Ligand binder design. Structure first.
Ligand SMILES: *[C@@H]1O[C@H](CO)[C@@H](O)[C@H](O)[C@H]1NC(C)=O
Ligand SMILES: *[C@@H]1O[C@H](CO)[C@@H](O)[C@H](O)[C@H]1NC(C)=O
Ligand SMILES: *[C@@H]1O[C@H](CO)[C@@H](O)[C@H](O)[C@H]1NC(C)=O
Ligand SMILES: *[C@@H]1O[C@H](CO)[C@@H](O)[C@H](O)[C@H]1NC(C)=O
Lengths: 116, 116
């Protein structure tokens, strides 16, 4: 189903970290579990993540270089559903939704993978 | 999907977190109608999962006791005492930090669980 301790929602499995890492180290961790930093594709998914995450900021799998659009982990372009606030290069969830920061900062993170 | 729509997956079970309130027996009747029971909360890990997702309101769980007698799960087995339960009530609920107890006729949100 989902691996031990991962949380199941709709067709995905989610890992919420206890520790903090920078964004690229977080994605390296997710990749080691055949997963990615969360690819949050829907409002229902966003709301599930906000409800479980607790008060800490958590990285998700959206990033950009300056003067380049937001990209998913696979390098394709993100199209807005919910907004990502600010001017940072890496995206995370705070208590109101998505925000952006410098990629070198340490936050908690969320991994996702398919349940299949 | 491992669980029905609106249910959350954890450790091979599916969890339902209510929006409305009911007394404890009426909550159990609702779970029963969905082929489930009020959540058993067998482990400390399950306790923490439920506290993280439930939100700020009190939620009934599937433990109850008669006058000065041990706590029992819905299924009739004696509780394995894996966390403290505060107070002097006959029905257990989760508050924001752990488990407590109240009179069974009082109204609260509830959590159901079933195998996936
Ligand atoms: C890339 O990832 C995004 C987000 O999960 C997905 O919508 C898109 O279909 C994927 N594209 C490819 C070519 O895999
Ligand atoms: C990200 O963190 C790792 C340590 O986990 C470190 O090796 C690397 O220097 C960091 N990258 C940046 C941009 O700070
Ligand atoms: C009763 O439920 C508990 C709590 O989940 C479970 O661990 C135990 O096996 C059950 N007992 C019986 C007799 O089914
Ligand atoms: C519990 O609530 C139900 C209806 O929701 C009601 O029929 C019953 O009287 C209540 N039980 C107690 C002990 O008050």
């Amino acid at each position: 189903a989902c691996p031990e301790s991962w949380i199941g929602f709709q067709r995905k499995c989610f890992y919420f970290s206890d520790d903090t890492k920078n964004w690229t180290s977080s994605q390296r961790f997710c990749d080691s579990q055949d997963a990615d930093l969360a690819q949050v594709e829907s409002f229902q998914e966003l709301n599930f993540l906000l409800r479980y995450k607790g008060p800490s900021d958590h990285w998700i799998g959206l990033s950009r270089e300056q003067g380049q659009p937001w990209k998913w982990i696979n390098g394709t372009e993100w199209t807005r559903q919910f907004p990502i606030l600010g001017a940072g290069e890496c995206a995370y969830l705070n208590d109101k939704g998505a925000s952006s920061a410098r990629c070198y900062t340490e936050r908690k993170w969320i991994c996702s993978k398919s349940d299949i």
